[PDB]
Ligand binder design. Structure first.
Ligand SMILES: *[C@@H]1O[C@H](CO[C@@H]2O[C@@H](C)[C@@H](O)[C@@H](O)[C@@H]2O)[C@@H](O[C@@H]2O[C@H](CO)[C@@H](O[C@@H]3O[C@H](CO[C@H]4O[C@H](CO)[C@@H](O)[C@H](O)[C@@H]4O)[C@@H](O)[C@H](O[C@H]4O[C@H](CO)[C@@H](O)[C@H](O)[C@@H]4O)[C@@H]3O)[C@H](O)[C@H]2NC(C)=O)[C@H](O)[C@H]1NC(C)=O
Ligand SMILES: *[C@@H]1O[C@H](CO)[C@@H](O)[C@H](O)[C@H]1NC(C)=O
Lengths: 99, 43, 123, 35
């Protein structure tokens, strides 16, 4: 399965990030990651909407259309976010940069 | 016959319990007369 | 919990590289090791997943026949051997703790890759 | 079993499984999947 991802916003603004799947997903096998420049990615959301331990961040969606939102951007949110699907093998989207 | 192998097969509450015993024999007719007890190996 | 990997290496095409990963802060047996590749300017690619319990390994089609993964539970480590390297393989190779698949049963789980190492750069 | 020893643990999965008609239904621990 192939994931396609689709951000210029100031700190304090609400951000919406999204990914589309070529095929439907079990939903519970959707995860989102955050990768700061110079650092390894970390898990933010798993199970479509559940928040990972240690993580304003929230996930949701169904079928082939899912999102990740940040209620208010911080200077530390200016990272590349990734959409991961792992119900049938494993795949990631290209990634979305937030500035 | 030179070797005797005995088994117990029972199916209880979804479990298939297997007991067995191995012992040498010297008899070309049927099962030798005698006594031994079989022990559980597989469940 | 912390994952640590080896430093960077430079290889010529046709050469092999052995990328090591060590981890601590948790029982090793219950979590698998996921290898994820990221070429400069690119996104994340799943390479494979290995069970630290029984040795079962799943691989992404792109690396099948090229990469062999193994584990050693006595040192709390895992290794990824990449054979017949190409210039196309210049990338950072990340080791991550993996809870998207069961270490004991091999079934899909509701989770993700939580604790990542720093990434080993191989040219 | 009537003399069952163990623990039964359960939780709501409305936000995990529901959409979903892929869950089918009709001795102790007998699993009869004949159709
Ligand atoms: C099913 O998976 C659930 C999620 O698992 C996590 O996420 C996945 C993607 C992987 O990364 C996996 O490795 C993660 O663990 C799992 O839920 C988790 O259960 C553990 C307990 O085993 C929880 O750890 C404890 O957290 C509390 C603090 O919780 C508060 O703060 C967090 C901040 O993120 C909030 O999200 C919570 O809602 C709370 O507000 C700690 O205080 C606690 O430490 C104390 O207890 C431990 C022993 O357990 C002692 O050693 C310490 O010294 C302390 O006394 C733990 O750290 C974890 O928070 C929880 N995560 C979530 C998101 O719910 C679930 O248990 C799994 N089910 C089964 C059957 O395994
Ligand atoms: C096993 O099959 C027989 C028919 O040969 C049936 O009468 C019996 O009820 C079945 N037992 C169980 C536990 O389904």
């Amino acid at each position: 399965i192939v994931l396609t991802q689709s951000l210029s916003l100031s700190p304090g603004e609400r951000a919406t990030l999204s990914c589309r799947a070529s095929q439907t997903v079990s939903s519970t096998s959707l995860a989102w990651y955050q990768q700061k420049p110079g650092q390894a990615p970390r898990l933010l959301i798993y199970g479509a909407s559940s928040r990972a331990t240690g993580i304003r961040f929230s996930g949701s969606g169904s079928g082939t259309d899912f999102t990740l939102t940040i209620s208010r951007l911080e200077p530390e949110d200016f990272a590349v976010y990734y959409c991961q699907q792992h119900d049938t093998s494993l795949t990631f989207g290209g990634g979305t940069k937030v500035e | 016959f030179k070797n005797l192998r005995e088994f117990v097969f029972k199916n209880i509450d979804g479990y298939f319990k297997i007991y067995s015993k191995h012992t040498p024999i010297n008899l070309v007719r049927d099962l030798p007369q005698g006594f031994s007890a079989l022990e559980p190996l597989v469940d | 919990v912390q994952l640590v990997q080896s430093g960077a290496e430079v290889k010529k095409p046709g050469a092999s590289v052995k990328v090591s990963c060590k981890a601590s802060g948790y029982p090793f047996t219950s979590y698998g090791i996921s290898w994820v590749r990221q070429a400069p300017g690119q996104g994340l690619e799943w390479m494979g997943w290995i069970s630290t319990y029984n040795g079962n390994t799943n691989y992404a089609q792109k690396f099948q026949g090229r990469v062999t993964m193994t584990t050693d539970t006595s040192t709390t480590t895992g290794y990824m051997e990449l054979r017949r390297l190409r210039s196309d393989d210049t990338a950072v190779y990340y080791c991550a703790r993996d809870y998207t698949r069961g270490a004991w049963f091999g079934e899909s789980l509701i989770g993700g890759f939580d604790n990542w190492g720093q990434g080993t750069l191989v040219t | 079993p009537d003399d069952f020893t163990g623990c039964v643990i359960a939780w709501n999965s409305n936000n995990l499984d529901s959409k979903n008609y892929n869950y089918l239904y009709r001795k102790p621990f007998e699993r009869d999947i004949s159709t």
